[PDB]
Design an enzyme around this catalytic site. Structure first.
Site, short mmCIF file in Angstrom:
data_model
loop_
_atom_site.label_atom_id
_atom_site.label_comp_id
_atom_site.label_asym_id
_atom_site.label_seq_id
_atom_site.Cartn_x
_atom_site.Cartn_y
_atom_site.Cartn_z
N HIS A 197 -79.32 -38.09 -2.73
CA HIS A 197 -79.80 -37.74 -1.13
C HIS A 197 -80.21 -39.05 -0.74
O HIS A 197 -80.24 -39.91 -1.79
CB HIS A 197 -80.83 -37.04 -1.48
CG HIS A 197 -81.63 -37.29 -2.77
ND1 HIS A 197 -81.74 -36.79 -4.21
CD2 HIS A 197 -83.16 -37.84 -2.33
CE1 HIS A 197 -82.75 -37.00 -4.56
NE2 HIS A 197 -83.35 -38.11 -3.61
N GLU A 209 -92.03 -31.13 3.42
CA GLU A 209 -91.33 -32.56 3.46
C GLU A 209 -90.41 -31.19 3.79
O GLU A 209 -90.07 -29.73 3.70
CB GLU A 209 -90.79 -32.84 1.62
CG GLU A 209 -89.83 -31.39 1.05
CD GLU A 209 -89.64 -31.61 -0.80
OE1 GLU A 209 -90.51 -32.33 -1.44
OE2 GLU A 209 -88.21 -30.86 -1.14
N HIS A 263 -80.08 -49.91 8.20
CA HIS A 263 -79.28 -48.55 8.89
C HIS A 263 -78.81 -47.97 7.91
O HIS A 263 -77.74 -48.89 6.62
CB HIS A 263 -79.20 -48.44 9.92
CG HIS A 263 -77.20 -49.82 10.08
ND1 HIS A 263 -77.50 -51.80 10.35
CD2 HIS A 263 -76.19 -49.84 10.20
CE1 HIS A 263 -77.26 -51.77 10.05
NE2 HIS A 263 -75.37 -50.26 10.06
N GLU A 275 -77.15 -46.10 13.16
CA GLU A 275 -75.89 -46.13 14.04
C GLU A 275 -74.99 -44.69 13.93
O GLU A 275 -74.65 -44.63 12.52
CB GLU A 275 -75.43 -47.63 13.33
CG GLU A 275 -73.60 -47.61 13.92
CD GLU A 275 -73.57 -49.64 13.13
OE1 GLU A 275 -74.06 -49.31 12.35
OE2 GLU A 275 -72.41 -50.05 13.37
MN MN Z 1 -85.48 -38.79 -4.13
MN MN Z 2 -73.82 -50.79 10.56
#
Ligand code: MN
Ligand code: MN
Lengths: 126, 127
Positions: A7, A39, A64, A113
């Protein structure tokens, strides 16, 4: 041996605003105590993402996460991101066959992105 | 689309140090200039990761990327990480049937996790 991605977890200030971002732009699917660190988990295209309360609160950087999209829907995606009023890097002028990406922020300084075409890092166009 | 993950790009001070982190710990496979920012791509269990030289650092937070490992490899990976010398958040005492994670940083203030067992976020354990 590493067996797969488990994750990604991100810290944001406001889970409702980030929820709106993940659902409106990525069609994130939300899966699901008095905690101070609330969360949420979502699935986006096979990836489990945890968002948890904390501090937005860093500096911007060029780190990113890029999600793959089809070239044909780059303009549609750009219009949904523009609807959230989040910070975007204006797309530059482009030549034919140059693969397109959209770079833009959430409400907590994370850079995302959406990437179409040939895998590569495109930040140097900005 | 969203078809899937395209890639993750991390910015780092020294590409050679990070290559060793990724390769020694994650068994990352390196993929395929005179820039004052060069890049590498690696593959880790199907994830395309680019690393790119830049600035100097960034403060530490709890944003992290977690990779999946099996319970019977946790102690072995723990060794592989300490041997590299990176900062690691040491495992706490634990009860039976709780899955284990290892949380540790690279050389550029990025938090990483090796997660075995049931999916959940385990940061609260270090409070
Ligand atoms: Mn974690
Ligand atoms: Mn990129």
């Amino acid at each position: 041996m590493i067996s797969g991605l488990s994750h990604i977890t991100l810290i944001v200030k406001d889970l409702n605003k980030t929820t709106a971002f993940l659902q409106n732009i990525f069609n994130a699917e939300e899966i699901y105590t008095f905690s101070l660190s609330k969360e949420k988990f979502f699935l986006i295209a096979g990836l489990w993402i945890c968002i948890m309360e904390g501090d937005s609160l860093q500096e911007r950087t060029y780190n990113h996460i890029a999600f793959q999209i089809q070239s044909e829907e780059v303009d549609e995606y750009t219009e949904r991101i523009k609807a959230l009023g989040v910070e975007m890097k204006p797309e530059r002028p482009r030549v034919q066959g140059e693969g397109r990406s959209i770079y833009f922020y959430d409400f907590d300084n994370h850079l995302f992105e959406l990437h179409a075409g040939t895998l590569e890092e495109r930040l140097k166009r900005y």
